[PDB]
Structures are given as C-alpha cells and as structure tokens.
Symmetry: D2
Subunit: 426 residues, 4 copies
Amino acid sequence: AIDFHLSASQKGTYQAARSLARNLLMPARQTYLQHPPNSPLRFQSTQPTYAAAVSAGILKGQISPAHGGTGGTLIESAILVEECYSVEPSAALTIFATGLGLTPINLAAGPQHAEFLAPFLSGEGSPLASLVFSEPGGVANALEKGAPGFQTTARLEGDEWVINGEKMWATNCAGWDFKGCDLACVVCRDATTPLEEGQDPENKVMIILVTRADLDRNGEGSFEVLRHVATPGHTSVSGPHVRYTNVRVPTKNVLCPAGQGAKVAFGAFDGSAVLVGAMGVGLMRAAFDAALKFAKEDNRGGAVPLLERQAFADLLSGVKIQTEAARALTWKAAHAMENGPGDYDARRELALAAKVFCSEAAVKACTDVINAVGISAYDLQRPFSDLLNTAVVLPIFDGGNVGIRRRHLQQLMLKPTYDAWSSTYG
Amino acid sequence: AIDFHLSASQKGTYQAARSLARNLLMPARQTYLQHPPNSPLRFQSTQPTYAAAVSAGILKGQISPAHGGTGGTLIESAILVEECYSVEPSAALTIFATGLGLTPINLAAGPQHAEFLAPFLSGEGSPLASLVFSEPGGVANALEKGAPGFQTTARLEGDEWVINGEKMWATNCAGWDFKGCDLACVVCRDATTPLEEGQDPENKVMIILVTRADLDRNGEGSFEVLRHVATPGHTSVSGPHVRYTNVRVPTKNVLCPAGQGAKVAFGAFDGSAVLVGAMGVGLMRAAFDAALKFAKEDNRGGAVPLLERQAFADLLSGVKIQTEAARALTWKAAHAMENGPGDYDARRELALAAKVFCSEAAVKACTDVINAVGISAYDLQRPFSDLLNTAVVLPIFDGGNVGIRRRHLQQLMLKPTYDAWSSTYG
Amino acid sequence: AIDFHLSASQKGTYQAARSLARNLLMPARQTYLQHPPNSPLRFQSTQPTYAAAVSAGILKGQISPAHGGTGGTLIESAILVEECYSVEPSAALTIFATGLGLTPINLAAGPQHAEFLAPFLSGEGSPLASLVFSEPGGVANALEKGAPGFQTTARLEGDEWVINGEKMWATNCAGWDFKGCDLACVVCRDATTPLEEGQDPENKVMIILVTRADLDRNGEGSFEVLRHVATPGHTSVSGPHVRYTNVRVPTKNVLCPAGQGAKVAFGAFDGSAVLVGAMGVGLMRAAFDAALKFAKEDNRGGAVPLLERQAFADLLSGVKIQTEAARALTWKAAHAMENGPGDYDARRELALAAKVFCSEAAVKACTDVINAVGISAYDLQRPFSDLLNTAVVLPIFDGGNVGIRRRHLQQLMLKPTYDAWSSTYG
Amino acid sequence: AIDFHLSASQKGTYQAARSLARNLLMPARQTYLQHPPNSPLRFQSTQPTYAAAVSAGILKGQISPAHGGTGGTLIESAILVEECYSVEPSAALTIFATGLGLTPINLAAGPQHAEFLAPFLSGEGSPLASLVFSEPGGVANALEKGAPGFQTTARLEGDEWVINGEKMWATNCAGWDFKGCDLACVVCRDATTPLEEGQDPENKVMIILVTRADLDRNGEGSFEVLRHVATPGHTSVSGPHVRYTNVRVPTKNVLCPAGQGAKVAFGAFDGSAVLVGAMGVGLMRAAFDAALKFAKEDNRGGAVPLLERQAFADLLSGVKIQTEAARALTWKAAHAMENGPGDYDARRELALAAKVFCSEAAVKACTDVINAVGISAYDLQRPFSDLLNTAVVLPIFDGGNVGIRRRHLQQLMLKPTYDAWSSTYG
Ligand SMILES: Cc1cc2nc3c(=O)[nH]c(=O)nc-3n(C[C@H](O)[C@H](O)[C@H](O)COP(=O)(O)OP(=O)(O)OC[C@H]3O[C@@H](n4cnc5c(N)ncnc54)[C@H](O)[C@@H]3O)c2cc1C
Ligand SMILES: Cc1cc2nc3c(=O)[nH]c(=O)nc-3n(C[C@H](O)[C@H](O)[C@H](O)COP(=O)(O)OP(=O)(O)OC[C@H]3O[C@@H](n4cnc5c(N)ncnc54)[C@H](O)[C@@H]3O)c2cc1C
Ligand SMILES: Cc1cc2nc3c(=O)[nH]c(=O)nc-3n(C[C@H](O)[C@H](O)[C@H](O)COP(=O)(O)OP(=O)(O)OC[C@H]3O[C@@H](n4cnc5c(N)ncnc54)[C@H](O)[C@@H]3O)c2cc1C
Ligand SMILES: Cc1cc2nc3c(=O)[nH]c(=O)nc-3n(C[C@H](O)[C@H](O)[C@H](O)COP(=O)(O)OP(=O)(O)OC[C@H]3O[C@@H](n4cnc5c(N)ncnc54)[C@H](O)[C@@H]3O)c2cc1C
Ligand SMILES: [Mg+2]
Ligand SMILES: [Mg+2]
C-alpha cells in the first residue's frame, strides 16, 4: 500500500548515514584540503577515513547475503547516498565506487568467485574495488556495429586469459598506491576469435576479474598510470587514465563469458542510476539549505528580510519543489527495482528516469541558488561553487544522459512488450 | 515503510475510476460536443451524465464518513482524478467542483449543518455544490493589508445575514438552470462593523452557506448571471460572472464566523492543490499515450520507425520522465497531507509543490508532444490541441501559481518554525 | 556600417504595414467571426480584405523585379509580417501564403513562365497562389533513402505531364470557390522512370505549376476537396486535404525538372524561415502589449499596482527581453540571406536559427503571459488563448524544427567547409 | 538603413582585437598559471602584460574624445570585448575594469578633473582605475527607503571630505601592490547631515575620487586589504574586501555631489551592461568552438562522426542559435544606446536586456556543451569547466540579474512614459 513513512529500520539507516557523514566524511574533507586541488595526494589522504568506513561494516553491506554479505536495499542505499552527498560528495564517492565495483559480482558471481570477495567480507583493512568500463577514446559506441569496439581486449592463450588495454575514469582502479586496486571488474572484448561479418559486437563482451595479486604476479609494467586527471569537483576521487599490459589471469578469473558481459555491466549501471538520482537529491538539499541559511541571516542591506523579495523567494521555492519531486521519483525507482510492479524493462525505465531527472535538476538547482544568493556565491569561502562543480558530473558520468541513458530509454519504448504505466498500475 | 504497491482498495479505486471515465464521462463528451463550443448549453447538457454518477455514489464519496458519506483518502482521490483527467477533463471537473464545494463543510461543519448535506447524501437527483471564492476583480490580494479586500460582503441585520457582491469563475455556482446551485459556500468579508485601523483583514473573512432554497425565498433578482465566460478548454464547465443582491439568510447558514473563513477556505485549497497535481499527471499520461500511439503507427513516411530518431524519442522519454516525477510527488503530497510526518505547515508545502510542479509540467508536456508529433498535431481530429488547452488552466486556476501558490510557499519559508525536510525525515 | 535604424523607405514599409493591419486586417477579423470556426466559409468572408491588399500592390511586391514585380527585401517583409501577426495572424497568412507559392517562381522561373504571373501582376481582383508540398503521410522523410517518397506523383506521357496525388496543409490551394486556386506550385515525384537501386531519391523531385485554367480544362474529378482540416489557430485560413486526379499539363508547366525541385523547395523554405521568425516576433509583441495593458489598468484588487509585484514584472520583462532578441536575430538573418557575408550555407544557418529561436520563444512567451495575467487569460473575450494557439503552430509548420530544420543544421555543420562565424565576421 | 555589415573601421577593430587577445592575453594566462589557483600573485603577475596593453593604446580607448581620449562606439567596444572573452576572460576583465572605473569620469568630469585622467592618457606605465561601488553587506538595496543605505560614508569637515567604509568586489581597487589603485571612483553616502524623515536616500549619494597619492598622503592605516577573495574563475582578477579609514580629500576630488552620484553610477552600469552582453557572446563562441573542435576530431569510438549523432548535433546547434541571438541583441543595444531611437529610458531597457539575456544564455551554453562533450568535459585539461566557472559570474556581477537588473526593468515598465517599442520603431 502507498506509504512514504520510513520504517524503524529505514530511520536507523538515515541516522547512521547522518553520523557517517558528520563523523567520517567531514574530517576527511578537512584532511584532503591540506593538499592542492590537483594533487593525487587528496585521494591518498582519505584512506584512513575509508578504513573507518570499512570497520563500520560499509563494504559488507555492499555484498549480497547470497554471497555472504550483509547487503541492504536500494531504498536504504538511496537514503545513505543523499545524506552523504548533502555533506561531502568526494570522499563518499570513493566508498560508493567500491560498491559499484562489487555490483557485477553480486549480479553474476558463482560459488567459484567466493575467494575474490574475501578481503571485502573481512570487516577490516581498506580494500578497493572498481568497475573498469570506460576508456580514453570513449565507450558510448562500444556495442555499435561497424565501430572499433572496446579497445581493451582479452585473449585465451593456453589456460590463461590475457588482457591488454587502456582504461580511464574507472574510480578506484589504481588502488591506494597507484599500482592497482584489490579487485577490478574489467569490461573487455574477447578477441580470441575475430568478430564475424555482421555479428553483433555485444556477442564478444566479457567481464574478467583482475586482483592486485594478479598484477603483482604478472610483474613490472603490467599496470601503469598514464595520467592522473584533475577534476573541478570530486577532487579526492581517483579514476586515472591507466594501461594493462599482457595481464595473464587463470580461467577462474572470468566473471562473465563472452556475450554476457554487456548485460551485467548495464545491470550494474541500472542500480547506480538510482543512486545517481540520490546524489542529485543530496546536492539539491545542500544547495537549498545553504541558500535558505544565507537568506535567514543576511538581508543584503534591505529594509526587509531577503525572503520577502518575491524574485528571491521564487528561486528558492522552485529548488525546493524540484528536490521534493526528485526524491519521490528516486524512491519510486529504488522501490520498483527490487519490488515491481512491471518486468525488468519497466523497472529499469524508472531507474533511468531518476538518473536523468535528478542529475539535471541538481545542475539547474545549483545555478538557480547562485543567482538567488548573488555575487556572494562567487566567493569560494561559501559552498555554492563546489556544489555546482559537483553537480555537473551527474548528467555525464555513470553513463552520460545524452549518449547512453537516453539511447536506452529509446530502445525500451521500441519494444513490442513496452507497457507505459506497468511500473505503477501493475 | 516505503512502499509504492497499490493496496486492494487502491486497485479498486483505480478500476472504478477507469469504469466511471469510460462509461459516464466519455458519453458526456459525445453529448456536449453536439452543442456550440462557446455555449452554456454544453454544461447544461451534462446533467444526465452527472445524475448517473450521483446514482453510482460519486457525491456520497465526496463526503467524509464523519458526516454520513463514504469519503476515502486523498491518495485514492489522486488516483481517481488522474484517470478521469486522462480521459475527459471537462465533464470530470464539474463533478470534482461539487467535491470542492463540499470540502469546507467536511472541514468545519457543525451539528446544524447536517441538513445542508442531505441532498448530497441522497444518492439521487443531480445536486450541484460550489466553493464560491473568486471575484471579477481578482482575489490574490483579498487578505492584503491596505487593499480593498473581498468585494463580496455580508452584514448582520437583526437575525439574518445579508449578502452582497459579485463572484466569477466559481464552478457550478449558477446551477443547471443558471438561477442558483443547490449549495454554495460563499466566502466573503464581514462588514457589520468596519475593519479597524491596521487590523488584519483575515479577521473579517467568513464562509456563509447559500442554498437554492434561500435564493428562491429571496425572490426576483436576488441572483443573476451577468456573463457566461467561454473558455478554450473545460467547455462544459460553468463558472459565470454572477451577482448576489441582498441575499438574506438565517444565522444557521454561517459555516465560518468572521475570522475563521480564510483558514478553512485555504485548507480546502490545500487538498485541491494535491488533486490539481493529479489532474496534471492525467493530462501528461494522456499526451504521452496519444504520442506513443501515433509513433507506433506512423513512421512519417520514413526509412526507419519514428522512435528511431534520437530527436523524436528524446521528446517522448522527456515527457515520460516528467510524468513519473509528477505522480511520485503528487502521491507523496497526498500521503503526507493525511499522515505526515511534519507540522501542517510542513505537509502543506508539499501539496503546494505538487500543484505548481505538475500544473506547469503538464503544459510543457503538451507543448513537447505537439512538437514531436509535428504538423499533424495542429489537426483538430487529434487530441493534442484540446490537451494543451486543458493543461493551460492548471497553473492559473485553483489559486494561480504566480500570485497565490508561490506567495504561500514564500510565507511558509519565512516562518521561524520552517523546517525544510521534516515532511520527509521528521 | 552596423545600423539598426530604418531607412526612410523602411519607415514607409512599416507605416504601410500598420495601415494595412489596422484598416484591412482588423475588420477582416470582425467579419469572419460571423461564421463557424471549423467552417471554410469563415475563410470566404476574407475576400474583400485580400482584394484590398491586392489593390494596394501587395501581390506585385511578392514578385521580383526580374519577373516584372515590385519585389522588396526580406527585411521589409519581416517588418510587414511582424506588424500583421501582432494584429491578425489568420487573415494575414492567406496573403503571405500566396507569397510563398510565388517564391519558387522567383527562384526558378525562366522566360517561358511569364504567362503564369500575369494574374498576379495585373493588380486586379484576388488571385491566390500556393506552394503545394505537404501530404497526409508527412514529408520530413520523402527525401530519405528507403522510404515510399512523395505520394503525389507526376509522369511524362508523350508531351504532357500527368499528375496524381493527395495533398494537405497547402494554404490557399483550393481557391475561393473550392474548385482550385489560380496558381499552385505542386512539389512531386517523377514516376516516369522508376528510381534506380541505391539512388538518392532527391533526383526524382520536381515542381510543376497547375493553374485553375488547367483544372477547368481537365474537367470534373480532376480536383477534389476530400477533407477540410480544422485548426486551433489561423481559423480563417483554408488548406484542406485535396486530391489531384489525372491532372494533365503541357511541358511548359514544369518549373523544376526532376532533380532540381528539392533545392528550390528548401530555398523557398529558407526565405520563409526568416518570416516565421517575424511571425514569432509579432505574436510576442502582441502578447507583451496585452499583458502590459492589462497590468496598467487592473491591479487585481491589490494595494499596489500589478507591476510592483516582482514575480509579475519579471514574467513581463522576460518576454520583452526574448522579443528584442527574436527581432534582432530575425533582422540579422533577413539581412544576411540577401547580403552575406556568409556563403549560402552560412546564410541559411541564420535563417533556420531565426525560425527555431523565434517560434519556440513565441510559444514560451504566450505561456508566460498567461501565467502572469492569471485566470483572466482563460477568458476567450481576452486575446491570450488565441495568441498561444497561433504560436504553437510556428515550430511545426513550414518545416518543423525537430524533423527538418535541425536536421539541416546538422548537415550544415557536418560540411568540411562549415565556417561558424563567417556570417558575421567574414 | 538596417545593415549588419561591419564598416572598414569595425573590421579594423575586430582584427586588432584578435591580435591583442592572441599577443597580450594568451601570454598573461601562461604567466599567471605558474602561481597557485587562489594566489593574489596571479593578479600581480599580469602587470607586465597590462603595461603592454597600455602601450598599445587600450586605456586611451577607454576615455571619451571629450576628455582627450580616443574612445569609440559601444559597438566597437562590444567587438573587442567578445573577442577578448572568447580567448582569455580573466586577464581581459582586469583591463576592462579600468574602463569601468573611468566611466563615471567620462560621464561627469568637470574642468578640475582633467589632472586625474592624465596618467591614463600617457600611453605608458600601468595605471589602474576602479569603480568602487560594491560592499560586503550587499548593495542591491542601497537606495531603498527604510534601509541602512551604503555603509561607506563621506562627511565634509572644513575644506576636506572624509571617507570611511568597507568595500568588496571592486575590481582593481587595491592596485598592483595592494595599497590602493591609481584612481578609484568611490560611491558613498553623504553623512554630513542626516537623512530627513521620509527623504529619498538617493539624495545623499555621491561619487568621490580617491587617488593613490591621496592614500599615501593620508598615511598608514588609511587603506587596508582585509581579505583576498578566491573565485572559481577570473583567478587573476583582484576585487578584495578592503577598508578606507578617515581618508581625507580636497573638494576638487568630488565628482558627483550628493544627490547626483546614483544617476552617474547607474549610467556607468548601463554602458557596462552592453559589454556584459558581449562577454556572454564571447564565452558562448568559445564554448561552441571548443565543442565543435572536439566533435570534428573525436567520434567517441563510433561508426560515424560525432556530429552525426542527432543528440550531439542538436545540443551544438542550440548553442549556435542562442549565440547568434545574443550577439544580435548585444549589437542592437550597443547601437540604440548611442543612436536611439527612443528616450534614454527606452535605450536603457535594451542595455539591461542584453546583459540579462546574454549572461544567462552563456551559463546555459556552457552546461549544454558539457553534456554534449560528455565525461571528457570534467577533465581540467580541457577548457569546458573553466568556461562554465567564468560564465556563472555574468548573471551575478555588474549588478546581479535578480536583485538589480530586473528591478530596473520593473521600474522602467512602471513609468507612465514607458513606450514599449520606441527603441525600435520610435
Ligand atoms: C567522478 C567520475 C567517476 C566515474 N566512475 C566510473 C567508474 O566507476 N567506472 C567506469 O568505468 N567509468 C566511470 N566514470 C566514467 C563515466 O561513467 C562516463 O559516463 C563514461 O566514461 C561514459 O562517458 P560518456 O557518457 O560521455 O560517453 P562518451 O563515449 O565519452 O560520449 C561522450 C558524448 O558523446 C556523445 N555521443 C557519443 N555517442 C553517442 C551516440 N551514440 N548517440 C548520441 N550521442 C553520442 C554524447 O553527447 C556523449 O555525451 C567516472 C567518471 C567520473 C568523472
Ligand atoms: C475552469 C475553472 C474553474 C474554477 N473553479 C473555481 C471554483 O470552483 N471556485 C472559485 O472560487 N474559483 C474558481 N476558479 C478560479 C480560480 O480558482 C483562480 O485561480 C482564482 O480566481 C485566482 O486567480 P489568480 O490566481 O489568477 O488570481 P488573480 O487575483 O486573478 O491574479 C492574477 C495574476 O495577477 C498577478 N498577481 C496578483 N497579485 C499578485 C501578488 N500579490 N504577487 C504576485 N503576483 C500577483 C499574478 O501573476 C496572478 O497570476 C476557476 C477558474 C476556472 C477557469
Ligand atoms: C498554418 C499552416 C500552413 C501551412 N502552409 C503550407 C504550405 O503553404 N505548403 C506546404 O507544402 N505545407 C504547408 N504547411 C505544412 C508545413 O509545411 C509542415 O511543416 C510540413 O508538412 C512538414 O511538417 P513536419 O515538420 O511536422 O514534418 P512531418 O514529416 O509531418 O513530421 C512531423 C514530426 O515527425 C518527426 N520526424 C520525422 N522525421 C524525422 C527525422 N528524420 N528526424 C527527427 N524527427 C523526425 C519530427 O519530430 C517532426 O516534428 C502548413 C501547415 C500549417 C499548420
Ligand atoms: C569578478 C567580479 C568583478 C566585479 N567588478 C566590480 C567592480 O568593478 N566594481 C564594483 O563595485 N563591484 C564589482 N563586482 C561586484 C558586482 O558588481 C556585483 O554584481 C554587485 O556587488 C551586486 O551584487 P548583487 O547583484 O548580488 O547584489 P546583492 O546586494 O549582493 O544581492 C544579492 C542577492 O540578493 C537578492 N536580492 C537582494 N535585494 C533584492 C531585491 N531588492 N529584490 C530581489 N532580490 C534581491 C538577489 O537575488 C541578489 O542576487 C564584481 C564582482 C566580481 C565577482
Ligand atoms: Mg479592480
Ligand atoms: Mg548586513
């Protein structure tokens, strides 16, 4: 039955989220601010915060009970993500990115993959996982007929899969010391045999695990950071341009065989679309809160309070309205992904809707709040610039809206089985 | 606990709504279409349909069980309103307006007001009710200090209240024969004693009941239609410019005494704000459905299916995303209004949000699908033009966004007790 | 030398436009309102107006001096169109549609075509022209490799061309008495010899003249009015669904040989794009004027003038700003089309820009003004609803923004010779 | 005569602007980039290239011919500003800000003021001027009845004016060495006698010159930089929070006596509004060019060029359209400000319009281009982030759109003399 009240457990999640952001993430921010904005040392300095998160069981919660994890719901994740993004986006993302890295494992792992999950179930240390998908040259057209396909390839040679390629933007993939993370899910193209004339490129896509142990065993030059990328927000996040060279792994490392990889990757990106929605809600909440606090304490030298000016008030209420719509849609999507109604195609349309709606609304909200607050918002002592520069990544990352998210919505509607309102009216 | 599944009762509401719309409303439209677009004969011709709806208990459903009715939840009203607006907005509104007319009684009735509700609990005939608020000269500033205030006044003379003034836009107020509807809740300004220097005009606002009976007793010309207004949509809806001249009623007709009328009127308007949200969702659904249908069956003489144009698909998926957000927000507001969490001030901000967001989103969606369908959509054989001309009213009526709904949002934020997210997180 | 001042002549053009609109167009409106909105005899009552326009040399002005006319500049046309659309769009469009019909003749006519312009150069009566290009099944994809192409076809049987096809939306094509207009440029597909395998469907496109004399000559059944298309705006304009059956004409009637018709059609559409911009400017001007007028006389019962409300004033000034941008862009495109400094590609990018910017701005302006004016704008006694219903056609007619106008912009930019700012800086 | 062709003198200005930007501004950028992002040394490091611009005659060009300068038309200024902003906004703004500082003197100088202008007319050194208006507490309400008014005050004590107050954001006011620029136009309120009951605060507003020589004469503590403000773009621009303490100047230093200052300051801001339009155009051009460059050399791993994606193309053409409207509007305002037709009030409206339209269109263009380019736009190696962070200042600076520019538009429309289209057709 239609209910917007948090359960006692969901309220616990909210309170826990508040404490995590306040006690772990805020100190992480003061810590990385001690290094210049283009320094990879920002990322490295967050390792002790990450460890503290690990000790509190965050990584265990990112693994499904099927695999021995404690795993929660997308709804609970959405609540956590909103709160963290309202406080400290960059340090939070490093943690959420490990969750993304572990998602393909939740979706496709079998019993033989348990050994790979062990470091993450330990409840100690600071292991990092990464979903290693994107490439320097772009991947919006990795599955397009007539195109080159993924640049990163795997070849079965004897009893070993051999990986070669360059990747970029894959959060966490280089690990704390830039020599490779604990567990990478590398999305690549099987090239043991050539793509046949007219064959669907998706038939060749795999996901193969690569651990830090694999890289070490393969020795010098097997993994290399080609370029650290400085970004205008998320300054403690590390997703460098990297290269894998002749990285040989055992057959047990294959997660998704050729022809099953794309589906699992997009499956992982469906879940994260929901949390990108939550990211947007969190930034919008932070923007509204900061603008409202500005108004309530600063009348800009006027004869009346700032909120008594219709033009200012209407900008703020506009943001509040979009934020409330964004959270409702995000929760609807989080609920539907795990409960229906509607088949998977219908559930996924909502996750994509949340992603697209909230990411763009977050950018618009940030720009509106800047105009409302006025010239003061150009002062970097105030939070407004960082908010905007955090928001603008939402539409373009986790599968950009223009080149990926919207192309999928197109394919969904094209299907004969498309049933517009099934995700609502059963 | 966060849940978006419809209960059995909510599924039932939805099924009954589909039935009502297809079986009663659609025929009402075939009937009124036979009269000229700008003729009050359209409204008059809907009486048979209306009475049939009365026979199915629709009016009983607009009255709270506390007063003898079968009224349900705001959530169920949202589901009903969405479906009716997706099929036939004009015939639907005349019915919903009686519901609005009855709301102030549902909210503030005393034991002595039971007799006034009798015709509406009868289950037969075709009694009309009206919330009579708007006036030819505007009402956004009715409560504004230094302004004239309501043009409609009532003054206590002996043992009868005497009502004088002109109203406009008040749906149903003139009844089927244009000589006065069964039950009108007349909002007006006590003028028995003058507003005192600097006194809050809200102190004088009353709601007085006026029945067809009262009007008949008052004789020749106590009620007069001064002008029938022709509208581009809602053509079977009747809310003329009218005048009450020396309408004398017994003290039992007072629903809200001077200084209590404003709060009750605005309380009614908070509930209706949620349902305007639902109206917006329903038009959006109708526009998306019609556009999708067209696209599935006309490739515009193209070499591929219409949906295969990035540009066309993007307009439609844009509408879908906005509609899902609009419904999610509407249901959240519907739920919160009756369940919290948060102050009434908190709950209220969400109802206003739904009104503003969905009304404007409805107009955008209709504009978008017109562009997507193309030149064909100027063709009055298709539903698109009437969709737009219906949607355009949503932002301006039931308290316009610009001068009323946003002014209320402004005032809520201005309160020292404003607590932004209490309506979600407590 | 950059100059926005009207020359003496251009001021003359503007005064003439003002006079035409005030003395001819306004009365045409009061006149055609006497007849039904979906009736084609509303259209017939506008003849005296058209004939007065003809008397004043308007039609001679639509023909270039090369072909014996008194043709002016695109800038003067933009001035005229803006004024007319700010007053009376429907009656005005009948006149302008003749200008469009005549345009391919201005672009493509040779010595042998002089005979066809005679009725338009005589300064007598009320001859109508029409560019008959649009078909029931759409035409955005008539030029596309794989599609059924134009459904209207012409084939060379001996020494006469035989034309068969159905048409729609072609303003003016059926004449005053509905038996066919004086002069139609029929755009069609050469079905004399089948299109070759893998051949650009453009190669078979023609334009062929068809006079009322030709229709009369082919006798009964040669021209038939199938369906009259009712539209929400332009209610006095007649552009029905018609069929040409075995319409036989001499080889002199060919204006554009197979393979040349597409370029000339789009050439004509470039010119009109600029004028669609002017239409948009005109509607925006009227919307702003009406809203401003409303505000200066009606304070909506407020304690202060309506323009003292920030939210209201910002809506109005937003419209004023867009209108000024719209006109400045329209004039730039009008100037560049005939004067450079672009090459033809650069020039038409600006014409398309004007069409897209102003059409969309007009729709947005009409929506904004309705919200600003409020509930009063739903009253058909006021001009706001009609304004919206006219503007909504601008993005979709004369080559919709979505399936053609932007498709051409894309092709322009794809050319290796594209030089972004050459239309301004050389 | 409506003409969009540049004259030989305007072509000359364009060519000189290209050369100046490339030779002076680009090297300024490579120079200041050697210092940290937030360092005041970025500003200081631009002195040598500022001196080169001075030697090139740039400051002479900011002074009106009436004072011995070679200042040209606003149109030519708009051409220069667009080019400079398309190349290097930050170093450009420092130069343009000296022009703003000289503007009140161009507008109001008396014979006694020629000595103050002398340093700026020599063609050597690197003199800086500042219009010192803005204050930490805000200034949108400096003229509001019932408000505190400017915090910066001046009092006549004998034969000297004594100035006290804090200013913030006033570009260049602190000079190269942070101890005060060469020539500051300080906007302040006369506090010699108190404001009378219900008196217009405008009556007390003055502009008083303050030179570095004045500051040195007044001794230690008379001028102090309180805080250098770090900004997300314009990182070489210095407009710190500063304090003037008991700064005494002779009466010759008074530029606008009490009651004349506000009109001159706003006069300066009317001219600057046009040039902000041009800054907007320049950033839009730069964003469009950078995205087109990326598209023409990077197909994102596709089977077709990036421009063949309808999605990408539609985003770029949208930016191109807005840019053409922006420039057209800016040039119209430039021309009308100096040539009419219309009142000063009418001309003024167009300047305000260009500022509001173009500033907001620049922000929208930058966000659109980021979405089109995709994740690559988040890489600080590419120009898109810096473009956005430059663009967001435009709506909020030089008199913010929400608090100032739109309030001026509102006051214009409120005048009985308002004549909507006089600046076009008057
Ligand atoms: C902070 C951060 C964290 C990230 N996390 C990860 C991660 O954990 N793992 C990972 O693998 N990657 C990660 N990424 C990368 C991110 O997911 C990107 O969205 C991904 O690289 C795809 O980028 P894109 O959508 O721009 O596609 P691209 O291929 O780069 O396309 C770019 C643009 O080209 C256009 N385009 C291309 N093809 C088409 C088409 N067919 N139709 C229409 N338009 C088209 C679109 O306009 C699109 O916006 C991260 C990036 C950042 C900045
Ligand atoms: C189909 C239909 C059904 C209706 N049903 C009913 C009904 O059942 N009962 C009833 O009483 N009425 C009814 N109405 C009227 C409807 O409720 C209107 O919204 C109501 O009259 C208020 O209109 P408004 O908001 O435009 O206020 P107005 O006072 O008309 O204000 C108009 C505009 O002025 C501007 N404005 C005025 N004051 C301010 C301010 N202080 N600040 C900023 N801007 C301001 C705003 O832009 C506002 O939009 C109906 C109307 C229609 C068309
Ligand atoms: C008042 C009025 C006057 C008119 N006057 C004339 C006239 O004088 N002469 C004449 O010939 N016609 C006339 N027309 C019709 C006008 O020329 C139409 O614009 C023309 O028929 C093309 O319509 P369209 O752009 O909707 O294209 P259509 O082919 O009808 O398609 C419409 C929609 O299909 C989608 N679409 C189709 N293909 C694509 C694609 N490849 N990419 C993206 N989207 C696509 C687009 O979203 C587009 O909006 C008139 C119409 C009106 C209303
Ligand atoms: C790079 C840069 C260069 C600059 N150059 C100069 C310079 O050379 N000289 C100089 O003096 N300053 C300069 N400034 C400051 C600039 O001119 C600002 O626009 C100015 O300080 C006014 O800011 P504001 O419009 O936000 O007004 P504020 O008073 O700061 O108002 C802030 C916000 O409050 C709200 N508000 C306040 N009052 C009202 C109201 N009455 N109605 C509605 N809303 C209201 C509005 O949303 C407004 O945006 C510069 C600033 C920067 C960043
Ligand atoms: Mg009045
Ligand atoms: Mg203060």
